[PDB]
Antibody, heavy 217, light 206 residues
Framework: QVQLVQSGAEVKKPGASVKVSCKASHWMHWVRQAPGQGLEWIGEFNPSNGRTNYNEKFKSKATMTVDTSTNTAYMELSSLRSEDTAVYYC??????????????WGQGTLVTVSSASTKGPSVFPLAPSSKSTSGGTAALGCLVKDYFPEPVTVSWNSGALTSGVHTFPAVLQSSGLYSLSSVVTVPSSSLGTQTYICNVNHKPSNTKVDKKVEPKS | MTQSPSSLSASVGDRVTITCSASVTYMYWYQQKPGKAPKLLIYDTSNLASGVPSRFSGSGSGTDYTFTISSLQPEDIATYYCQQWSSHIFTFGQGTKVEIKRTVAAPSVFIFPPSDEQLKSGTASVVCLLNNFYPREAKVQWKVDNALQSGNSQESVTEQDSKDSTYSLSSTLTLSKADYEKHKVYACEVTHQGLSSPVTKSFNRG
């Protein structure tokens, strides 16, 4: 039961530095998934002693460090540019009881490189009505608007309501702020009794919004 | 390096094959389901990772490598990546999106009026939702007092859901309060293969 946990989303100015951490709750890897570029290998490190081997592209700008006594790995990227906007992952491999290899990855950290200002989300209810019912099932949700940067993460109620939830890919508004929607489909009869709340977490602005979604006629 | 195809559609139970061309020592294959982190399925070319079903396989030599799913299941909906290794040196393919082919399913079309809270803040968003359709292709048109709109509108679609092999789509139309109040009828009109005619979902007021 090994699990990798990463620090939160960051926005930095071009030419600035960012540090992503990776805690463990075989050599380990830093990988990124960037706009256009796809998956990109950054480098590897020995978790036991901190020896490093970088991808050439990254040797100048990236530095990988390990704190073996906390089991925390770090990756710092300097001289940030727009191409560095990406989800950064730490990952490792091991083998199971009978010798099969497997891997495990952190949840990823989105780093946005931008000079634009940070904007916390506007959260509005998509109210369930006769116009959002399809028989037996009603749809409801929340519209998240006017935020920057990504990501906003949406969970419902206590955060253990996940079945029937669709959280749509982020879009660009006319203003170039970001918008998304999360929509949950529920048994019609439950609207009576259950209270539905969208929890919208925007780590870049240190903002969470809890919005109740009431039915409308 | 190139990975092909870049997208493929197949029925449940179909055998499915992805290739990844070219001085490589080993090929690795990763699965990335919607939105999770990638997951290693095949390593050193041909070896299944811990807990990977027997329906997955990998093979290759020199420059040409293959990844096979011998009986495609809905849980296999994902983007798959090859990754070559030499030389202290790791590079990834471009990705192959894998979709299930199913029967045509018409969208349920829903509409959401602007919230009171938004209206009080000087803006008005209408949301149109198309739920659980296949295939992905649809036409969505916004109409205000019968006038086709462009662009105060956005749209996005889920990746294919593994539980019924369908997509969903959300579309937002956004006006000022002032503009919203000057007009009466708000409608999204939807065309899709599984619909018998265009469905208009609408509401009045403002």
């Amino acid at each position: 039961q090994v699990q990798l946990v990463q620090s939160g989303a960051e926005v930095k100015k071009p030419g600035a530095s960012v540090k992503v951490s990776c805690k463990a709750s075989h050599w380990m890897h830093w990988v990124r998934q960037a706009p256009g570029q796809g998956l990109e290998w950054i480098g590897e490190f020995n978790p036991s002693n901190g020896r490093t081997n970088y991808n050439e592209k990254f040797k100048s700008k990236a530095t990988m460090t390990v704190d073996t006594s906390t089991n925390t790995a770090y990756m710092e990227l300097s001289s940030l540019r727009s191409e560095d906007t990406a989800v950064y992952y730490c990952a490792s491999r091991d083998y199971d009881y009978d010798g099969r290899y497997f891997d495990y990855w952190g949840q990823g950290t989105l780093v946005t490189v931008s000079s634009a200002s940070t904007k916390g989300p506007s959260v509005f209810p998509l109210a369930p009505s006769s116009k959002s019912t399809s028989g037996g099932t009603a749809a409801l949700g929340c519209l998240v608007k006017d935020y920057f940067p990504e990501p906003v993460t949406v969970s419902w109620n206590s955060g253990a309501l996940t079945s029937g939830v669709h959280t749509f890919p982020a879009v660009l508004q006319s203003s170039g702020l970001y918008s998304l929607s999360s929509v949950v489909t529920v048994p019609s009869s439950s609207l009576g009794t259950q209270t539905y709340i969208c929890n919208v977490n925007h780590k870049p602005s240190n903002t969470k919004v809890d919005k109740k979604v009431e039915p409308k006629s | 390096m190139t990975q092909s195809p870049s997208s493929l559609s197949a029925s449940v139970g179909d055998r499915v094959t992805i290739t990844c061309s070219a001085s490589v020592t080993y090929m690795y294959w990763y699965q990335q389901k919607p939105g999770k982190a990638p997951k290693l399925l095949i390593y050193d070319t041909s070896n299944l990772a811990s807990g990977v079903p027997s329906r997955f396989s990998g093979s290759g030599s020199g420059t040409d490598y293959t990844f096979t799913i011998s009986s495609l299941q809905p849980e296999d909906i994902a983007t798959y990546y090859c990754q070559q290794w030499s030389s202290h040196i790791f590079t990834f393919g471009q990705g192959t999106k894998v979709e299930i082919k199913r029967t045509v399913a018409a969208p349920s079309v829903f509409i959401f009026p602007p919230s009171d809270e938004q209206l009080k803040s000087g803006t008005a968003s209408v949301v149109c939702l198309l739920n659980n359709f296949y295939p992905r292709e649809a036409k969505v048109q916004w109409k205000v007092d019968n006038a086709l709109q462009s662009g105060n509108s956005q749209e996005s679609v889920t990746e294919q859901d593994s539980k019924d092999s369908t997509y969903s789509l959300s579309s937002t139309l956004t006006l000022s309060k002032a503009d919203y109040e000057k007009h009466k009828v708000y409608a999204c009109e939807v065309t899709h293969q599984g619909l018998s005619s265009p469905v208009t979902k609408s509401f009045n007021r403002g």
